[PDB]
């Protein structure tokens, strides 16, 4: 019932709805699978890189400010608990 409890919410989303739904499942799976936050960032980048070819930069922290140059429609912003799963593919 932990998956129901997390209720991850995407504050800002710039991606197709079908792709966005897939990201939520990966984000929930990554948090339980990874013992530490640093492991979560590596797991999200590896899964997305395998799923979609390109260069992916992912940063997750309790408090942070980010300005980035990402390919249009490849940036999805979702916040679960105190962790921000942010991925932006840059060509």
């Amino acid at each position: 019932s932990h998956l129901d409890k997390v209720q991850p919410v995407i504050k800002n989303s710039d991606m197709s709805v079908e792709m966005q739904k897939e990201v939520e499942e990966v984000a929930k799976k990554a948090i339980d699978y990874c013992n530490t936050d640093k492991e979560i960032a590596t797991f999200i980048k590896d899964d997305f890189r395998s799923r979609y070819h390109g260069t992916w930069h992912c940063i997750v922290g309790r408090n942070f400010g980010s300005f980035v140059t990402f390919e249009r429609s490849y940036y999805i912003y979702l916040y679960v608990g105190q962790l921000a799963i942010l991925l932006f593919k840059t060509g």
Binding site: T36, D37, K38, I40, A41, T42, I44, K45, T55, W56, H57, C58, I59, V60, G61, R62, N63, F64, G65, S66, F67, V68, T69, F70, A84, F88, T90
Partner: protein
């Protein structure tokens, strides 16, 4: 006195201009130009209450004109990230207090 007298709250209050570099991967000459610009820009846009978005917007615009068209820098209190960057294009330096700054060239 000295270190024993000093406290974490006291140390932050005593010095706000102290600069600490944790990770260096960019050429030193390039780092000197970047370090002066980021410190000056953050203080100018700090305002009454520091804004993470405000600091990044000023830094992103200055860096793009200064070196390359696609430059990404992220600053947060605490974060975990995996980033793929070009050789000698990433500089990591955190300001005194709870301020972590990451700047890289893509």
């Amino acid at each position: 006195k000295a270190v024993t007298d000093m406290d974490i709250n006291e140390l932050r209050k005593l010095m706000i201009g102290k600069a600490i570099i944790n990770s260096s991967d960019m050429q030193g000459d390039l780092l000197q130009e970047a370090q002066d610009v980021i410190q000056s820009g953050i203080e100018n846009n700090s305002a009454p209450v520091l804004n993470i978005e405000a600091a990044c917007k000023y830094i992103k615009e200055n860096l793009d004109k200064k070196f390359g068209p696609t430059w990404q820098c992220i600053i947060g209190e605490g974060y975990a990230y995996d980033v793929t960057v070009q050789n000698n294009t990433l500089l990591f330096m955190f300001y005194n207090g709870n301020l972590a700054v990451l700047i890289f060239k893509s």
